[PDB]
Amino acid sequence: RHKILHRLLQE
Amino acid sequence: KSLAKRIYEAYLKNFNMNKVKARVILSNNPPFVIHDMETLCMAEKTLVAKLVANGIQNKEAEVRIFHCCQCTSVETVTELTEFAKAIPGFANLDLNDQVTLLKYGVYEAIFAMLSSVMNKDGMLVAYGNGFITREFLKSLRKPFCDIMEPKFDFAMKFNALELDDSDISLFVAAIICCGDRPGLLNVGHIEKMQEGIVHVLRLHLQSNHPDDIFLLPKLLQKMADLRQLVTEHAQLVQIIKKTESDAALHPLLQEIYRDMY
Ligand SMILES: *[C@@H](/C=C\C/C=C\C/C=C\C/C=C\CCC(=O)O)CC(=O)C/C=C\CC
């Protein structure tokens, strides 16, 4: 549901 | 004592715009002000704007402002995740916790943070390159006018406190991590984090603003006021996407907004 946010933290 | 400085240091690197700089600028030339549509078009045309707006072409002044607004949100939200990471013990939290706090958090943090560039006369734009009149923002056809004004109303009362960058960083960190947010995997670790961060503020206020001994109560209040504003903001944004054919929402913004109100 939150692709961008998960990617942001993990990088 | 270590926690507080670490937030200040983390905050300083992450955010391009800080209170001292906004106040200071307000130095060969003063930031170009837009008090008019004509002025906005010329401001919109200029090399800096063209470079940094993604080259928006919408054909609606109100539509372009709303899209232009978004670059700031995405830019701030990206920075907020990094700030959150710097905060001790945030890294530990589960992805559902980290993401959930951010989705509710990012817009609350911005509104308090937005204040420093904000002035009763206007708000700074393009990393302080431009000034936009509050009147002009308020003039734009409904419902575009509504978004800026209450944020400014909050801004006026919030500015009055008044907070150093160190003060904000602590305030911001507390806003980001809240035990209350829906769907949190663990309540106790966030609540424990809040106590730490909030406690630092208490110690901090006593040395920093001896003149005001009541700052913490007033500062704490702002979060409740801020929560409403995000609800009010969320509802408005929803209106635009349904009402207006023209307006466009960034993918990141949609994920944050969805399920929030
Ligand atoms: C585009 C024109 C205007 C940009 C105006 C305001 C954006 C600033 C802050 C918005 C913050 C949050 C948005 C909240 C949300 O939508 O969710 C470029 C331009 O011409 C201005 C550039 C320089 C001015 C001289």
Token reading at B39: 């002025």
Cite the beta strand spans of chain B per DSSP E: 32-34, 122-125, 130-133
Cα B259 to Cα A5: distance, rounded to the nearest angstrom: 14
Buried b (16+ CB within 10 A) or exposed e, B177-216: bbbebeebeeeebbeebbebbbebbeebbeeebeeeeebb
- Between CA B231 and CA B208 the distance in angstroms is 32
**Number of domains within chain B:** 1
Residues of B in contact with A2 (CB under 8 A): 99, 103, 255
φ and ψ at residue B125, rounded to 5 degrees: -140, 155
Q: Are B177 and B190 in contact (CB under 8 A)?
A: yes
Answer yes or no: is B11 a known binding residue.
no
Candidate from B85, B102, B259 with C-beta closest to A5: B102
Q: Which residue has the tokens 């539509």?
A: B63
Residue numbers after which chain B breaks, C to N beyond 2.5 angstroms: 26
**B20 and B116 Cβ atoms separated by less than 8 Å:** no
Q: Which tokens hold the place of B260? A: 């929030």
Nearest partner of B124 among B30, B59, B29, B57, judged by Cα: B30
Question: Are B164 and B2 within 8 A, CB to CB?
Answer: no
- Provide the domain limits for residue B35: 1-261
Angle (CA) B195-B200-B205 rounded to 5° is: 125
* Resolution stated for this PDB structure, in Å: 3.5
CA distances from A11 to B66, B82, B104, B243 (A): 28, 11, 21, 35
Minimum CA distance residue for ligand 1 atom 9: B69
The vertex-B113 CA angle with A2 and B157, nearest 5°, equals: 130
Amino acid letter, residue B136: F
Minimum distance, in Å, between the CA of residue B25 and any CA atom of chain A: 32
Token duo for residue B209: 């603003």
CATH (domain of B238):
1.10.565.10
Between CA B81 and CA B84 the distance in angstroms is: 5
Question: What residue type is assigned to position B124 of the chain?
Answer: L
Contact A9 B78 (CB under 8 A): no
**Dist CA B164 CA A11 (whole Å):** 31
Technique of determination: X-ray
Quick check: B177 and B90 in contact, CB under 8 A?
Answer: yes
Is B253 at the interface with chain A, CB within 8 A? no
Nearest beta carbon to residue A5 from set B85, B99, B259: B99
Instruction: Note whether A11 contacts B: Cβ–Cβ < 8 A.
Output: no
| Distance separating alpha carbons of residues B125 and B72, to the nearest angstrom | 9
Torsion of CA B159, B160, B166, B168, to 10 degrees: -40
CA B132 distance to own-chain centroid: 17
Cβ count near B84 (within 10 Å): 25
* Other C-beta atoms lying within 10 Å of the C-beta of residue B159: 16
Distance (Å, rounded) from C-alpha B215 to C-alpha B54? 41
